[PDB]
Design a protein around this ligand. Structure first.
Ligand SMILES: Cc1cc2nc3c(=O)[nH]c(=O)nc-3n(C[C@H](O)[C@H](O)[C@H](O)COP(=O)(O)OP(=O)(O)OC[C@H]3O[C@@H](n4cnc5c(N)ncnc54)[C@H](O)[C@@H]3O)c2cc1C
Ligand SMILES: COCCN1CCN(C(=O)c2nc3cc(C(F)(F)F)c(C)c([N+](=O)[O-])c3s2)CC1
Length: 427
């Protein structure tokens, strides 16, 4: 049932034509993978979720791409064990809606709810609550992985095959196809947050606010970041922090249904940006994230700098604003401890996501950012990358050789392959 399709990431860049399989039948996907294995490998096969990754990890030029979104069955949700058993193609919006009546909450939510469970694991996604909860991989209790040999492995975070489990987490689909998974959810009594808002005046006090220990008082924390204004205004931020509300914290009107889902403006945004104990629904707490692809002519760039290299981070921010490249929408947060996945993006430190409009000199400038981020012990995120080099990536991820070793043991014939894998020499 494979049909030739032109495929891009969310950034609408680096297009490549591939045969796309779209079937809700698990057995047809098993046979398709076996067909590629009989061909000796050839150009290979990669899975694809909802295509929300900006880069080229979910495309395979001249090869096979398997669309996983038809596998969207939620098998079971259990309130006692807090476990959900879902097909890899169900998305986080669907899962959120289904789990709420059980008093359960998706443990890690990204900027958009239009991502699959498969895409969430393969990119080891992070959210507003990383410092308290880690990334998506931390909450996977088991996953069924279709490997190159045609076998479906039941993988767990500990015990036998634990190394393959952690190579799959953040593995960008290069260990096989996640068909099914069990996620441990977070218990909640409401669908609401209690939020404290703060507005900083400078990069200095933005960093001070994140270093004074106040982060330990909130499970959820992220900020909108100024990367255009000259110092000391550079790095000023609207910080939104909070935790899941309990029932009695809700206004009476909401208590019946707790689990139901210019210069003058800046003056206001400074005043209305400071608040304490505000009840907010999911949409409001993530606002304005609510407002088939994203806009073309934009280059998404996300990197994290280790906590200790604070001066190094401050310098990169300065380089960005003095560059002639302007990014209006910037998300900033302090990451918590990393997990044991070799290719996992998040490490403890200063994370920022910037959005440059595609202009003359941009490509070579972000190459200079790569070098700076690399020098200072940081890394960029694969789910946003389509232009960095193998050399830079390998140096940014010192456990990459460890990961490649696992990949070669599970896929010797290179049955699983993508545009990213070839570009970053992970193939
Ligand atoms: C507006 C926006 C906001 C975002 N905010 C955040 C954020 O806050 N935090 C964050 O971490 N990320 C964020 N992202 C990125 C996004 O969460 C990831 O790129 C995610 O992996 C995309 O999910 P997807 O289902 O679209 O997967 P795709 O983009 O289709 O694929 C991505 C990778 O997952 C693999 N994959 C997909 N399904 C399977 C499967 N069944 N088995 C094996 N491998 C599979 C593919 O091989 C590919 O390598 C954001 C993206 C957008 C567009
Ligand atoms: C309409 O254009 C707005 C730009 N959007 C916002 C920034 N973009 C993103 O990919 C991100 N969304 C979020 C959303 C969050 C959130 F706080 F969880 F919501 C976090 C913590 C990050 N992050 O990397 O720290 C990001 S990065 C790109 C899309």
């Amino acid at each position: 049932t494979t049909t030739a399709t032109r495929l891009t990431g969310w950034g609408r860049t680096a297009p490549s034509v591939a045969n796309v399989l779209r079937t809700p039948d698990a057995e047809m996907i098993v046979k398709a993978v076996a067909r590629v294995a009989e061909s000796g490998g050839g150009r290979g096969a990669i899975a694809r979720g909802l295509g929300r990754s900006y880069g080229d990890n979910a495309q395979n030029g001249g090869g096979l791409v398997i669309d996983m979104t038809p596998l969207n069955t939620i098998h079971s949700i259990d309130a006692d064990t807090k476990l959900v058993d879902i097909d890899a193609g169900v998305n986080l919006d669907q899962l959120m809606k289904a789990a709420l009546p059980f008093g359960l909450w998706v443990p890690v939510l990204p900027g958009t709810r239009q991502v699959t469970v498969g895409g969430a694991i393969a990119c080891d996604i992070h959210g507003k609550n990383h410092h308290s909860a880690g990334s998506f991989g931390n909450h996977v209790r088991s996953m069924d992985l279709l490997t190159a040999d045609g076998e479906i492995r039941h993988l767990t975070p500990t015990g036998e095959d634990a190394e393959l489990f952690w190579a799959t987490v953040g593995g960008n689909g290069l260990t096989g196809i996640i068909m099914r998974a069990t996620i441990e959810m977070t218990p909640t009594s409401t669908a609401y947050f209690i939020a404290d808002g703060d507005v900083t005046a400078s990069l200095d006090e933005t960093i001070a606010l994140h270093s004074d220990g106040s982060e330990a008082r909130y499970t959820y924390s992220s900020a909108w970041f100024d990367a255009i204004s000259a110092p000391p205004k550079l790095g000023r931020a609207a910080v939104s922090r909070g935790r899941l509300a309990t029932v009695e914290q809700l206004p009476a009107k909401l208590r019946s249904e707790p689990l139901k889902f210019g210069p003058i403006g800046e003056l206001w945004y400074r005043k209305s940006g400071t608040y304490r104990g505000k009840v907010q629904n999911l949409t409001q707490f993530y606002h304005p994230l609510d407002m088939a692809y994203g806009p073309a002519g934009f280059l998404q760039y996300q990197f994290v700098i280790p906590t200790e290299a604070v001066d190094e981070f401050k310098k990169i921010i300065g380089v960005i604003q003095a560059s002639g490249h302007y990014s209006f929408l910037n998300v900033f947060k302090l990451f918590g401890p990393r997990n044991q996945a070799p290719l996992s993006f998040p490490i403890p430190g200063w994370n920022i996501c910037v959005d440059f409009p595609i202009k003359d000199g941009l490509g070579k400038f972000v190459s200079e950012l790569d070098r700076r981020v690399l020098e200072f012990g940081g890394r960029l995120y694969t789910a946003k990358d389509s232009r960095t080099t193998a050399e830079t990536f390998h140096a940014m991820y010192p456990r990459v050789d460890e990961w490649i070793s696992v990949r070669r043991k599970v896929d010797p014939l290179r049955v699983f392959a993508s545009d990213m894998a070839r570009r970053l020499e992970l193939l």
